Design an enzyme around this catalytic site. Structure first.
Site, PDB file in Angstrom:
ATOM      1  N   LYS A 123      35.080  45.658  41.890  1.00  0.00           N
ATOM      2  CA  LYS A 123      36.448  45.268  41.550  1.00  0.00           C
ATOM      3  C   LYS A 123      36.997  46.198  40.464  1.00  0.00           C
ATOM      4  O   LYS A 123      36.449  46.253  39.362  1.00  0.00           O
ATOM      5  CB  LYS A 123      36.500  43.805  41.098  1.00  0.00           C
ATOM      6  CG  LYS A 123      37.900  43.205  41.068  1.00  0.00           C
ATOM      7  CD  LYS A 123      37.864  41.743  40.648  1.00  0.00           C
ATOM      8  CE  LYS A 123      39.245  41.105  40.703  1.00  0.00           C
ATOM      9  NZ  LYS A 123      40.153  41.602  39.631  1.00  0.00           N
ATOM     10  N   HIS A 162      45.903  32.990  38.233  1.00  0.00           N
ATOM     11  CA  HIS A 162      45.939  34.451  38.222  1.00  0.00           C
ATOM     12  C   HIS A 162      46.122  34.994  36.809  1.00  0.00           C
ATOM     13  O   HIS A 162      46.889  34.440  36.019  1.00  0.00           O
ATOM     14  CB  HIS A 162      47.070  34.975  39.114  1.00  0.00           C
ATOM     15  CG  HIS A 162      46.892  34.663  40.567  1.00  0.00           C
ATOM     16  ND1 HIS A 162      47.642  33.710  41.219  1.00  0.00           N
ATOM     17  CD2 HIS A 162      46.052  35.182  41.494  1.00  0.00           C
ATOM     18  CE1 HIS A 162      47.272  33.652  42.486  1.00  0.00           C
ATOM     19  NE2 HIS A 162      46.309  34.535  42.679  1.00  0.00           N
ATOM     20  N   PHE A 163      45.412  36.076  36.502  1.00  0.00           N
ATOM     21  CA  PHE A 163      45.600  36.795  35.247  1.00  0.00           C
ATOM     22  C   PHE A 163      46.544  37.964  35.498  1.00  0.00           C
ATOM     23  O   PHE A 163      46.165  38.962  36.119  1.00  0.00           O
ATOM     24  CB  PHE A 163      44.257  37.285  34.694  1.00  0.00           C
ATOM     25  CG  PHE A 163      44.303  37.690  33.245  1.00  0.00           C
ATOM     26  CD1 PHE A 163      44.628  38.993  32.880  1.00  0.00           C
ATOM     27  CD2 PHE A 163      44.009  36.768  32.244  1.00  0.00           C
ATOM     28  CE1 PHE A 163      44.670  39.371  31.540  1.00  0.00           C
ATOM     29  CE2 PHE A 163      44.047  37.135  30.901  1.00  0.00           C
ATOM     30  CZ  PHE A 163      44.377  38.439  30.549  1.00  0.00           C
ATOM     31  N   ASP A 164      47.780  37.828  35.022  1.00  0.00           N
ATOM     32  CA  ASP A 164      48.822  38.822  35.270  1.00  0.00           C
ATOM     33  C   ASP A 164      48.620  40.078  34.423  1.00  0.00           C
ATOM     34  O   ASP A 164      48.293  41.143  34.954  1.00  0.00           O
ATOM     35  CB  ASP A 164      50.211  38.216  35.036  1.00  0.00           C
ATOM     36  CG  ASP A 164      51.321  39.020  35.693  1.00  0.00           C
ATOM     37  OD1 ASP A 164      51.173  39.407  36.873  1.00  0.00           O
ATOM     38  OD2 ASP A 164      52.352  39.257  35.030  1.00  0.00           O
ATOM     39  N   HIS A 174      37.840  35.348  34.952  1.00  0.00           N
ATOM     40  CA  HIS A 174      38.537  35.614  33.689  1.00  0.00           C
ATOM     41  C   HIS A 174      38.103  34.777  32.479  1.00  0.00           C
ATOM     42  O   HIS A 174      38.740  34.841  31.424  1.00  0.00           O
ATOM     43  CB  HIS A 174      40.054  35.499  33.892  1.00  0.00           C
ATOM     44  CG  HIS A 174      40.577  36.326  35.024  1.00  0.00           C
ATOM     45  ND1 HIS A 174      40.671  37.699  34.963  1.00  0.00           N
ATOM     46  CD2 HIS A 174      41.032  35.973  36.249  1.00  0.00           C
ATOM     47  CE1 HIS A 174      41.159  38.157  36.102  1.00  0.00           C
ATOM     48  NE2 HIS A 174      41.389  37.129  36.900  1.00  0.00           N
TER      49      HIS A 174
HETATM   50 CL   LIG Z   1      42.498  41.156  35.415  1.00  0.00          CL
HETATM   51 CL   LIG Z   2      43.560  37.189  39.136  1.00  0.00          CL
END
Ligand SMILES: [Cl-]
Ligand SMILES: [Cl-]
Ligand SMILES: [Cl-]
Ligand SMILES: [Cl-]
Length: 124
Positions: free
Chosen positions: A41, A119-121, A12
């Site tokens: 992905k 984590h990217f929510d 990210h």
């Molecule tokens: Cl993402």
């Molecule tokens: Cl993530």
């Protein structure tokens, strides 16, 4: 094994550029960050801000995660980001991606010491 902090950075983070320059940005970045190794992905979002600015989000506006956790944090200001998603013709090992660039707030889940994003929510 890759740490949860470094995994977020690999997936990210893209501080090298201010924004997505072309439509082929995602096709290049998803391959360079090893996100198309054994499987393409489906959804991934890159941030075009400095590492310090994205790490600063963890000490900002506390919001609830999509799953139900309370460790997510929404950024105060809008950040330049690019969302990469598979197109209809995308099929391993020929992964194809749609490039979409916009300025939005980022929501990231944070854990550990130091308190860094893992984590990217979502993006708002
Ligand atoms: Cl993402
Ligand atoms: Cl993530
Ligand atoms: Cl680390
Ligand atoms: Cl750190």
């Amino acid at each position: 094994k890759e740490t949860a902090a470094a995994k977020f950075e690999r997936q990210h983070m893209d501080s090298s550029t201010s924004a997505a320059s072309s439509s082929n940005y995602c096709n290049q970045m998803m391959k360079s960050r090893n996100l198309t190794k054994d499987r393409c992905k489906p959804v991934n979002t890159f941030a075009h801000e400095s590492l310090a600015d994205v790490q600063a989000v963890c000490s900002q506006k506390n919001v609830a995660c999509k799953n139900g956790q309370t460790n997510c944090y929404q950024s105060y200001s809008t950040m330049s980001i690019t969302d990469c998603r598979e197109t209809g013709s995308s099929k391993y090992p020929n992964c194809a991606y749609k490039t979409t660039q916009a300025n939005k707030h980022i929501i990231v889940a944070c854990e550990g010491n130091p308190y860094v994003p893992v984590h990217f929510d979502a993006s708002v």
